[PDB]
Amino acid sequence: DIEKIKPYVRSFSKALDELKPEIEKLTSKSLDEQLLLLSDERAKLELINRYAYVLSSLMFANMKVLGVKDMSPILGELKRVKSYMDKAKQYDNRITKSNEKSQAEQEKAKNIISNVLD
Amino acid sequence: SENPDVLLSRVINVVRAASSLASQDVDFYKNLDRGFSKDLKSKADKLADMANEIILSIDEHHESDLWNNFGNIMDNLLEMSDHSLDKLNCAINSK
């Protein structure tokens, strides 16, 4: 009964310890330094969304442990971040579609070469 | 978590564990045991420090409070995000 809570606390505590080095790694330099070092715009978008994801997640985890009753405001930020990430996926799907089309043409070309000569 | 990105994996493990723990009867142990209550607050404070670490990474000028700070920063992050995606879409639609 009393012993029921302890594995939950242990699990949470272990998760925190594992996360801490990763946050240090993530923040080893400023966001602006990381962005200025990137040439690819899609990589910039991924990094920015990743920061928003990690930050709002920490805030959510913090508020759960503080035992906040009204979770609607922070869950709103999580919904926002998910929506933003889906916007990015939809751009990726469009890129993928044109990649596949390009791969299809190239596979066609190789077959033309290989086949007719055979 | 079997997320091949290590950071995202650690983040989701923390989020799920925090959620699981809070769904248990924490208030009951809070009343019964002072040590427990202080330990949770210590963990909450670790989370806030990590959030502040990220916030300092974003607002690099350094030559309710946490909550408001967090809200203003999220608006800044997602403004950058919209800017970046608008540029990506502009390029591909002009192509």
Q: Which key terms come to mind for this protein?
A:
heterodimer; A: mainly alpha; elongated; B: 95 residues; mainly alpha; 2 domains; 84% helix; hydrolase; nuclear exosome; RNA degradation; RNA processing
Can you characterise this structure?
The complex is a heterodimer of chains A (118) and B (95). Chain A has 118 residues and is an all-alpha fold. Chain A has one domain. Helix content of chain A is 85%, strand content 0%. Chain A is built from four helices and no strands. Chain A has helices spanning 5-26, 31-37, 41-65, 72-117. In chain A, helix 3 (41-65) packs antiparallel against helix 4. The radius of gyration of chain A is 23 Å and the shape is elongated. Chain B is mainly α. Chain B has helices spanning 6-23, 26-32, 34-58, 65-94. Chain B is elongated, with a radius of gyration of 19 Å. The relative contact order of chain B is 0.05. At the A-B interface, helix 1, helix 2, helix 3 and helix 4 of A face helix 1, helix 2, helix 3 and helix 4 of B. Chain B: It comes from Saccharomyces cerevisiae (strain ATCC 204508 / S288c). Chain B: This is Exosome complex exonuclease RRP6.
What is the radius of gyration of chain A computed over CA atoms, rounded to a whole number of angstroms?
Answer: 23 Å
Approximately what portion of the residues of chain A adopt beta-strand conformation?
under 5%
Strand content of chain B: under 5%
State the share of residues found in helices of chain B, binned by percent: over 70%
Structural class of chain A: mainly alpha
SS element count, helices of chain A: 4
- Radius of gyration of chain B (Å): 19 Å
General shape of chain A:
elongated
Main beta sheet of chain B: none
Oligomer state equals: heterodimer
Beta strand count of chain A: 0
